[PDB]
């Protein structure tokens, strides 16, 4: 009886509506992000769109600024709003402070907006979790995850959405300094992270690759094919 | 009609059921009656009995008003604690 209002505390001090908003994130396609020394990658599974529909409008990885990008989970309707407000915020921050927006700052503002939307009745929580990464630290790669609650955290590597637990365990098992020593190895690591929960062929794995002082580079199907071929070569070498 | 005892009725009932017990002259039965809204006669008798037992627990030879208030609390199974936001 304590889960029908956002501003009502349960006897054990639980805001159950916020947790129910969290539950919507787990119903979205997985997004995997891992940062390297000179690379930040955003793995995303595709839902194998209908044969008679265009994928161009089902974009899940979007860039807030010229050098910060985010991948979300949960409902697309809330995610689009969050991304639009984040873009407006980074542009406004550039206007007031000529320095480019920081990935930490944009993460903090996204978390603040989510928190403001889970602070009163008559405002449904944003049921999306965002994986914000970027080289905005001017020489330092950063990765961030915003829970729909309004809390953000810095992760060396993290996963959100359906099957996030398995990918998180995988990454905890093999995210090492040696694994991310080069960009190609980091991209391969993203590929192995996404393969286990997304079993399928090509076009089901979308990777966003951003290099230092560069722009977002959504890998074409040919590139993910060559990387998955490389992974198959590695596993056949292992056997 | 047998109604729920009012303030005067509750005070009189507590006086009746405390007649056999050694009670301080300082007990304000009018204050007790105010503190026991929606109490029937049986609950007032239980208030007196529990006040007597609370006095006996402390080894007090005579009852006190605070003993009666604690008995009022114990009749409805309520427990009073020092709340951290009530100062």
């Amino acid at each position: 009886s304590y889960d029908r209002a956002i501003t009502v505390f349960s006897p054990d001090g639980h805001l159950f509506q916020v947790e129910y908003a969290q539950e919507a994130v787990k119903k979205g396609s997985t997004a995997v992000g891992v940062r390297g020394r000179d690379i930040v990658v955003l793995g995303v599974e595709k839902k194998s769109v209908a044969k008679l529909q265009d994928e161009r409008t089902v974009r899940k990885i979007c860039a807030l600024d010229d050098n910060v990008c985010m991948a979300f989970a949960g409902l697309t309707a809330d995610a689009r709003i969050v991304i639009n407000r984040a873009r407006v915020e980074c542009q406004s921050h550039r206007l007031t402070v000529e320095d480019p927006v920081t990935v930490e700052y944009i993460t903090r503002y996204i978390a603040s907006l989510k928190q403001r939307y889970t602070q009163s009745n008559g405002r449904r929580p944003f049921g999306i979790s965002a994986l914000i990464v970027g080289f905005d630290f001017d020489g330092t790669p950063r990765l961030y995850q915003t829970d729909p609650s309004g809390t953000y955290h810095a992760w060396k590597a993290n996963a959100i959405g359906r099957g996030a637990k398995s990918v998180r365990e995988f990454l905890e098992k093999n995210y090492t300094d040696e694994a991310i020593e080069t960009d190609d190895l980091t991209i391969k690591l993203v590929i192995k992270a996404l393969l286990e929960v997304v079993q399928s062929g090509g076009k089901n794995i979308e990777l966003a690759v951003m290099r230092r002082d560069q722009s977002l580079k959504i890998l074409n199907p040919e590139e993910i094919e060559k990387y998955v071929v490389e992974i198959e070569k590695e596993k056949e070498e292992n056997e | 009609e047998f109604p729920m005892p009012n303030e005067e009725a509750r005070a009189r009932i507590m006086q009746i059921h405390s007649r056999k017990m050694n009670v301080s002259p300082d007990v304000n039965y009018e204050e007790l009656a105010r503190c026991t809204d929606d109490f029937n006669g049986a609950q007032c008798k239980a208030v007196c009995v529990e006040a007597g037992m609370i006095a006996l627990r402390r080894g007090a030879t005579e009852l006190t008003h605070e003993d009666y208030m604690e008995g009022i609390l114990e009749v409805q199974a309520k427990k009073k604690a020092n709340l951290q936001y009530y100062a």
Binding site: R4, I6, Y20, Q53, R56, D78, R80, R123 | -
Partner: protein, 248 residues
Amino acid sequence: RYDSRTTIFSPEGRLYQVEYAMEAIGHAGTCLGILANDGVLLAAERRNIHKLLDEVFFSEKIYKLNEDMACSVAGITSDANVLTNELRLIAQRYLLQYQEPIPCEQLVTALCDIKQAYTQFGGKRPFGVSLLYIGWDKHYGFQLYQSDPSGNYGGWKATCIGNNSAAAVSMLKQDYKEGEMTLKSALALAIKVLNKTMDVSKLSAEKVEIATLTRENGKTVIRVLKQKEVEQLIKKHEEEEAKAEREK
């Protein structure tokens, strides 16, 4: 239950009011659109075909928004009118600010943002209207856009909204040839689909509206087919069906 208001999240994390609004869309009349190489069209079914009802607007289901956009409508009539009025307002506002026609997707995104805001803030019910969009723009050309009551849109080549949507969409996916459809073939396919999408037989012209979008000399003329050409398409489909059963 967890459907008292739209802001309530189910323990599984589902907006029950939003899902209710979408499931309610099937009550609306059948609307569909086919994207062809030379243009895009919309097809609608008139549920109300009473002889005492006069047809004065001829556009009860298909609305013109901009000089290069049009939209079909399926859902609550009042919400439909509100959304189309807002669509015209956004279109003219963008035209005033930028002095160029809207790139289709921007206007659809504006409506979807408004609808999402309605399903997010308390005290407002979600807009129980799902509407298809057609238009041409300088960036990607002809596009067919779908809108849901939740504000989730998506690019599509051919869809159907309203009564018996699933069957129409399935047969669309079955017999649509990507990149090999002309406007005439698209019209024939739309008529074929609308024939058995609705239970009414013979596909009366008075019960069906079709509007087509074309790119002629950089003008983007929006044409609503009159009863004559609709009846010609009906007779063409009838003769095609007669030819098909000749093999039997």
